[PDB]
Amino acid sequence: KQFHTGIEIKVWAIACFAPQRQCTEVHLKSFTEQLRKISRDAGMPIQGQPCFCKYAQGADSVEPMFRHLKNTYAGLQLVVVILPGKTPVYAEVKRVGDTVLGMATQCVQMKNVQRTTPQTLSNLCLKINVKLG
């Protein structure tokens, strides 16, 4: 599909369902800094400072956390969700964001946050662009 310009992401959150011991804080800020630069260079800037960044565990944590976000940050445009490989967390993240609260969500694998590549960050910017485009 065609790329959309005029997109600016200012209020976004990070929900890390991957264990901290595997996907540490430096991994998160590094992944975020890289994402900021390439989304900037693509004309769809994502501000390098998320309004929220926390670790969580289990599908059951999803609804409470999303409800919390929705009630705390007005204008919240996106929730970047880090998953630890295949997990029911994904289904739940989608069930809650799509059919329950109307919240845009973008999932990404933990391995791609631990080790970023220009191609993966690119795939991400494209999926994100389609979603808020």
Task: Please give the Cα distance from 126 to 61 (Å, whole number).
Answer: 28
At 64, the amino acid letter reads P
Task: Please give the Cα distance from 131 to 105 (Å, whole number).
Answer: 8
CA distances to 19, 34, 36, 108 from 57, rounded to whole Å, are 8, 25, 26, 16
Please tell me whether residue 65 binds ligand GTG under the rule CB under 6 A: no
Query: What track of x and - describes contact with ligand GTG for positions 93 through 132 (by CB under 6 A)?
Result: -x----------xxxxx-----------------x-----
Output the smallest distance, CB 87 to ligand GTG, in A.
4
Comparing CB distances to ligand GTG, the nearer of 24 and 112 is 112
Comparing CB distances to ligand GTG, the nearer of 54 and 94 is 94
Shortest CA distance to 36 belongs to which of 12, 15, 52? 12
Q: How many residues bind ligand GTG (CB under 6 A)?
A: 11
Residues at the interface with ligand GTG (CB under 6 A) = 83, 86-87, 90, 94, 105-109, 127
